[PDB]
Amino acid sequence: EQSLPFFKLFSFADKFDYLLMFVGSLGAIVHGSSMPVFFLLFGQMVNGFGKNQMDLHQMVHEVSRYSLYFVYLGLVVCFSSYAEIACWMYSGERQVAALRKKYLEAVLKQDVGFFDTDARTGDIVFSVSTDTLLVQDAISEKVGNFIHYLSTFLAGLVVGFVSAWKLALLSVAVIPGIAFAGGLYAYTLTGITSKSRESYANAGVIAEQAIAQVRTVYSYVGESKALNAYSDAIQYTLKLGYKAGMAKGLGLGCTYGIACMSWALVFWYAGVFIRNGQTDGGKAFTAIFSAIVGGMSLGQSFSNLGAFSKGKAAGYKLMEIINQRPTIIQDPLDGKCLDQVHGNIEFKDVTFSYPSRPDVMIFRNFNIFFPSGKTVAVVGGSGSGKSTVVSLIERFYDPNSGQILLDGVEIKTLQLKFLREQIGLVNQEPALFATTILENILYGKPDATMVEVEAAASAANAHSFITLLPKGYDTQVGERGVQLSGGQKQRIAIARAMLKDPKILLLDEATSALDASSESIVQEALDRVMVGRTTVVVAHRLCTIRNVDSIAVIQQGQVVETGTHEELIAKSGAYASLIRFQEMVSTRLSHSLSTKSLSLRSGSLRNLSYSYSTGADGRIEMISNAETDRKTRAPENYFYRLLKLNSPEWPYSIMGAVGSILSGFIGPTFAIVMSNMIEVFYYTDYDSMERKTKEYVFIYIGAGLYAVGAYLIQHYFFSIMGENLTTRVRRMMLSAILRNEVGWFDEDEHNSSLIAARLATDAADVKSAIAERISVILQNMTSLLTSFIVAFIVEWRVSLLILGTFPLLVLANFAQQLSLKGFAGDTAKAHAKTSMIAGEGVSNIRTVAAFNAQSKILSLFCHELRVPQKRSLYRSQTSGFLFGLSQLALYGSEALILWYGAHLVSKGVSTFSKVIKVFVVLVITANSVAETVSLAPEIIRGGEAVGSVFSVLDRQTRIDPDDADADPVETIRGDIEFRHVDFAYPSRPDVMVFRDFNLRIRAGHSQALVGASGSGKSSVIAMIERFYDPLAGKVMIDGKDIRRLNLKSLRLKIGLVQQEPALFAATIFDNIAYGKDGATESEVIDAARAANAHGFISGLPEGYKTPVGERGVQLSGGQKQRIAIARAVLKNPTVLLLDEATSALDAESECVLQEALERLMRGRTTVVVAHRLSTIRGVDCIGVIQDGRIVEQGSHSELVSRPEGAYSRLLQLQTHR
Ligand SMILES: CC(C)[C@H](C)[C@@H](O)[C@H](O)[C@@H](C)[C@H]1CC[C@H]2[C@@H]3COC(=O)[C@H]4C[C@H](O)[C@H](O)C[C@]4(C)[C@H]3CC[C@]12C
Ligand SMILES: Nc1ncnc2c1ncn2[C@@H]1O[C@H](COP(=O)(O)OP(=O)(O)NP(=O)(O)O)[C@@H](O)[C@H]1O
Ligand SMILES: Nc1ncnc2c1ncn2[C@@H]1O[C@H](COP(=O)(O)OP(=O)(O)NP(=O)(O)O)[C@@H](O)[C@H]1O
Ligand SMILES: [Mg+2]
Ligand SMILES: [Mg+2]
């Protein structure tokens, strides 16, 4: 939206950076006007090297002068490419490093309640992560290319018009006949790719509903037809991907079909102006080639504007936080400083609301008093502003109406160094900055002594635990060297509360780690520090409040009652229901940053962003997103395997590769004709310069239609091979994802949001690893070959010195194509330890506001930024000097060859138009060789990270749904008998929810599994089918082992009903027939009238046809549950399985299960679980589990005979509505 001007991005430059942009601008101009000066000397060499063919002693003079000048020109490109790289890359680094210093100063001094996670602390941390890499990439080095390739254009039209201005308009005005046809290609390329990009999203929900509902898709046998709806939704991209291979041949055929009909136009009029006597054969070499490579080089200077519009936008967000004016600031002169405080805090009608939204009201008419030297207990039951009391004494906010006084002195007339130093804060998930266990304790006071740190951790239940660590109080909590990552989080944070020695002390509900005997150890540590200090207590559970010597209770805006724990238990005033409430019983930002960073990496480069994760429990882990270089390397034999998977089309690859060698002949067909017209321009018989220039125009036309029929073959083919490979792989991947166990889908890195991308993008980059890395080899390995055969027929004494110099002429043309992207290289990885230190400074700001840590983070950030400047000083000088020397060897070795040519002509060995036919061929050849060696690591080094998708094709499953040595199933009777059987989730095996679980089910019976307050209750049905394997023992079914049978034959006769039902993106005719294939119309209609819904399904305008999955009409959960029961009643199963869990019916006036329960159990073996104790009258048995063990069994007539057992607790929960 709002954006800065491009200027004022340089507004952080000091007095030293106005000299690294004046040196660095005279460097980029003299370098820019060097290719139009190379064309001024080379058209002055040939005018002595061939007009004097009759004077062999004038040639040796005037080529020994014009080939000394290509050493003087080599020492200008030596020191003017060293001054645009080593003076811009570093001078764009002292301005961003300075930015982060002004910025971090800005964030630390802002009112502390500005950050409330409502896309706020996921926006400030992201603004220091990416926006200081978009200000850097727009002002450092791409300005040094925008100046460079501009002054080539403004000096390619001065050397052009001075020498011969009557050709400096023919050579210029033709150029829009190339770009018009060069832009028609890139126009229709989008117009067909967008037809492929849009047609895939139809298939992007079929391979999504069959993964996000993989519990249902495995439960029925519905994976064999989940490919036939993904086969018939790629075929509308294959045949649409064919004719995009046609629009690349004719887009590269109609480019050399005008290009080879454009050199004929500017070489014909050159043959006219020489005969008429206006120019000569050397000055018409300059005025053509200066205006062409000068006029074509605005396609590079207008390529930097895409990276300039990202600078003005992302720079404005950084520049508005710095000058955002806060309210609660420190006044070091307009402030007081008391002495011998008592801590008599009194709120005198203090109202307050959240400044995010003043709609709700928190402290309407709030009035409490705090004593001196006592303990109070402000306590609520829920979010009635229970943590707002500590969030107001800190001045994290201001009260919008009211006044707060300390000992008769108000705190709004005080500075924020006398107040916050005297208050200690302990709260949930306590802040441990990634340092040792000596510097975290020194945030209370930076330098007192060593022995008081030990005395602080002595009365903290820590000193025993921090001397049983094999280092001298030196243990990294951020890095996972030694982990205190047990369930008992060892509270070292209380040592900060003890060493600081505060007068006022604001504790909080610091027992929320599933408290037990382990968290009772840190409880008594808290109970011994509240001595002689004004302190409060905030509590959630009242089991730890029973020894507190004053309790004041608020309910809504105001205090209700005061006193001690003798009258609080009395009078039943909002305490007797609350103790009945006691008896009736972050890590999201790393996903939130990964969403905002997603869907924005299409325009930005991959060496620019990050990839966020939780990592350890010390910080937010920022991976530099250049992890493709050193992670997930492909299997070594992949270049043979991908050819084997793509074989049946060996006819379509031989027919293509004979259309590839013919495309490599276009190189020397240009260079051998154009090296004959620099001969013919020096004839002296002006009618012999006409009959031998009609031959040199009918070949440019004759090789201008040749390129139409030799780019059309190489690109219509090698894409039929390239689109029967991103089809056969996309159908083998889904037939290899739907064979894994279900627990692989439970992991967060394998959700149904990334695995639908690894079939979209990562399976579509095999077209560019086996079809477009052969065609850019055989095109270039037949053009290198057919030019080193023509070079050894014409003259072999010069084409041997060029072959020895050829390892240098290809390095010099290799350095001219790394400089198009800039030599900075992975600029996210060096600035990635810096941002982690700014990552702990924002998301943990509530403890930085206390302790006065606002000047210790700034000196642990300006002490670490001295590493990414002395890395950008070494790299900017070495990679600016190894570029300025690899251009000296270019111009400094084109003046050895041409000198050596003008030496042999003196001895009569070889002649003119044999030096030129060897020198001009063997420079244009080397231009194409540094396009092949540039992709040399990408072939060998694993392809790339998106071509390394073999973790789904090459991955052995655990639970195989189909075997050969497995007996099929004839008829199940139902004989579920659980033998010694324990279980845990493979995702988190730390909890061991089943402990030698045992059951027994005879055929023709039922089961009445209790909810047991959600003790893994929906997991017994998970082991009837094989969603998981038991940790030990056998699941004895039908008197047999379950893991000795063919699994696809088993699941077709055991039908279940899922916990939270959802339907597929289809009408309601598949949804009630998805559990029964082969049935057509007859018993489908009767199948609906079981959970009846029959007027609900007949009440529809479009019959039964309604989209209920997505993008149609929306139904309710009580009505969706009606549809799901119609599945199992059509399948006619043997072992029915129902489920209820955690208030998921949502059907008031419950009648959707009065019909469905008692009419369905006619001849089946059922296992029914119910979370509510209602309609729980099972008719054959019952099962009640406690912590992985059943405790009682029988009918519902011996359960009521026991006085308590375990069911008597459940009947009291009926009255807890
Ligand atoms: C003039 C040469 C003898 C000289 C030694 C050589 O250094 C020259 O500067 C080379 C690098 C350049 C100068 C002009 C360029 C050509 C001018 O640009 C063009 O029109 C294109 C058309 C098409 O892209 C061709 O494949 C290359 C071609 C035709 C360019 C290929 C490379 C050059 C031939
Ligand atoms: N930053 C915020 N902006 C707006 N509302 C908030 C914010 N933080 C908390 N709230 C809500 O406003 C109410 C104030 O209660 P609060 O002071 O947070 O005590 P609490 O800790 O939520 N109660 P409990 O968790 O039961 O001990 C709560 O219901 C909060 O959920
Ligand atoms: N896929 C899973 N991976 C790891 N743990 C899980 C998974 N699913 C559930 N749990 C944990 O298992 C515990 C108990 O729930 P679970 O074992 O799923 O059955 P349940 O939810 O008790 N059934 P119900 O009582 O009917 O709601 C919970 O604390 C969950 O966190
Ligand atoms: Mg709280
Ligand atoms: Mg459940």
Q: What is the 3-state secondary structure (H, E, C) of 1036-1105?
A: EECCEEHHHECHHHHHHHCCECCCCCCCCCCCCCCCCCCCCCCCCCHHHHHHCCCCCCHHHHHCCCCCCC
Residue among 384, 507, 541 to mutate when testing ligand 2 (max atoms within 8 A of CB):
384
- Give the integer Cα–Cα distance in Å for 111 and 394: 11
In this structure, is the dihedral angle defined by the CA atoms of residues 912, 913, 915 and 916, taken in order, positive or negative?
positive
For ligand 3, atom 1, the nearest C-alpha belongs to 746
Ligand 4 centroid from CA 381, angstroms: 11
252 Cβ neighbours under 8 A, 6+ residues apart: 185, 707, 711, 715
Contact present, 927 and 813 (Cβ < 8 Å): yes
For strands 1035-1037 and 611-613, give the pairing: unpaired
Annotated binding site for brassinolide: 256, 263
The ligand that comes nearest to the alpha carbon of residue 292 is 1
The whole domain housing 1107 covers 1060-1132
Cα-to-centroid distance, 489 and ligand 5 (Å): 30
- CB of 861 within 8 A of CB of 837? yes
Q: Please name the residue whose Cα sits nearest to atom 29 of ligand 2.
A: 383
Q: How far is the CA of 380 from the centre of ligand 2 (A)?
A: 11
Asked if the structure places residue 1037 within a domain, the reply is: no
Could you tell me the distance, in angstroms and rounded to a whole number, from the CA of residue 1018 to the centre of ligand 3? 7
Pocket lined around ligand 2, Cβ cut-off 6 Å: 116, 354, 356, 362, 380, 382-383, 385-388, 540
Using DSSP's 3-state secondary structure scheme, residue 1010 falls into strand
Final residue in a domain of this structure, among 1090, 1108, 1132: 1132
Question: Which among 929, 978, 756 is positioned nearest to 205, based on CA atoms?
Answer: 756
Start-to-end Cα distance in the chain = 52
Written as six digits, the tokens of 1066 are 């289809």
Query: Residue 832 is encoded by which pair of tokens?
Result: 């990635």
Task: Tell me if 1103 is assigned to some domain.
Answer: yes
Q: Among 1112, 1132, 1152, give the residue marking a domain's end.
A: 1132
Centre of ligand 3 to C-alpha 1120, Å, is 23
Question: Is residue 1013 in contact with ligand 3, taking CB distance under 6 Å?
Answer: no
Q: Hey, whose CA ends up nearest to atom 1 of ligand 2?
A: 116
The ligand whose atoms approach the alpha carbon of 554 most closely is 2
Q: Is residue 602 situated within a structural domain?
A: yes
Distance in Å, CA 386 to ligand 2 centroid: 7
Counting Cα atoms < 13 Å in the Cβ hemisphere of 611 gives: 10
* Protein residue with its CA nearest to atom 26 in ligand 2: 382
Q: Which residues contact 458 (CB under 8 A, 6 or more apart)?
A: none
- 461 neighbors 522 (Cβ within 8 angstroms): yes
- Using the atom order of ligand 2, give the atom closest to the CA of residue 384: 15
Q: What is the Å distance from ligand 1's center to 924 Cα? A: 7
Atom 31 of ligand 3: nearest residue by CA position: 1016
Residue 292 Cα, ligand 1 centroid: separation in angstroms?
Answer: 9
CA distances to 457, 474, 752 from 468, in Å: 13, 12, 45
Strands 404-406 and 345-347, bridge-based pairing: antiparallel
The reply to whether ligand 3 has any atom less than 6 angstroms from the CB of 746 is yes
Nearest ligand 1 atom, CA 894: 5
Helices 176-200 and 235-253, packing angle to 10 deg = 170
CA distances in angstroms from 938 to 166, 526, 829, 1100, listed in the order given: 47, 60, 21, 58
Q: φ and ψ at 762, to 5 degrees?
A: -75, -15
Can you state the angle between helices 651-661 and 708-716, rounded to 10 degrees? 150
Q: For ligand 1, is residue 999 a contact (CB within 6 Å)? A: no
Nearest protein Cα to ligand 3, atom 13: 1016
User: Residue 841: which of 829, 858, 863 has the closest Cα?
Assistant: 858
Q: For ligand 3, what atom is nearest to the CA of residue 988?
A: 4
Residue 199 and residue 206: Cα distance in Å, rounded? 13
Which DSSP string corresponds to 625-672? S--SSSS-PPPTTHHHHHHHHTGGGSHHHHHHHHHHHTTTTHHHHHHH
- In angstroms, what is the span from residue 406 Cα to ligand 4's centroid? 25
Resolution in A: 3.9
Helix (H) / strand (E) element for 1009: namely strand 1008-1010
Residue 186 placed within a domain = no
In a domain, 1100, yes or no: yes
- Tell me if 1091 is assigned to some domain: yes
Annotated binding site for ATP: 116, 354, 356, 385-388, 509, 746, 985, 987-988, 1017-1019
Atom of ligand 2 nearest to the CA of 509: 27
In a domain, residue 744? The reply is no
Q: How far is CA 592 from CA 139, 586, 587, 793, in A?
A: 30, 10, 9, 67
Q: Tell me, what CATH number does 1086's domain have?
A: 3.40.50.300
Query: Considering every ligand atom, which ligand is closest to the CA of 742?
Result: 3
Q: 537 phi and psi, to 5 degrees?
A: -135, 130
> Greatest CA separation found in the chain?
130
Which of 1132, 1155, 1190 is a domain's end point? 1132
Question: What is the Cα–Cα distance from 681 to 270, expressed in whole angstroms?
Answer: 9
Does 1068 fall in a domain? yes
Assess whether the C-beta atom of 816 lies below 6 angstroms from ligand 1. no
Q: Is the CB of 293 under 6 A from ligand 1?
A: yes
Nearest ligand atom owner, CA of 384? 2
* Residues 1167, 1183: Cα–Cα separation, whole Å: 10
Using alpha carbons, list the distances in angstroms from residue 559 to 377, 536, 568. 12, 15, 14
How remote is the CA of residue 385 from the centroid of ligand 4, in Å? 9
Distances (CA, A) of 1077 to 561, 1050, 1128: 68, 16, 12
Contacts of 222 (CB under 8 A, 6+ apart): 216, 1074
Q: Which helix (H) or strand (E) element contains residue 611?
A: strand 611-613
Token pair, residue 619, equals: 């910080």
Q: Atom 21 in ligand 3: which residue has the minimum CA distance?
A: 1016
Helix, strand and coil content of the chain, in percent to the nearest 5, comes to 35, 5, 55
What the block records as the tokens of 1128 is 């199992």
Count the domains in the chain.
Answer: 2
Q: Other C-beta atoms within 10 Å of 913: how many?
A: 15
CB distance 340 to 514 below 8 Å: no
446: its two tokens: 């930076």
Ligand 3 atom nearest residue 1140's Cα:
26
**Does residue 1016 line the site of ligand 3, with CB under 6 A?**
yes
Total length of the chain: 1217
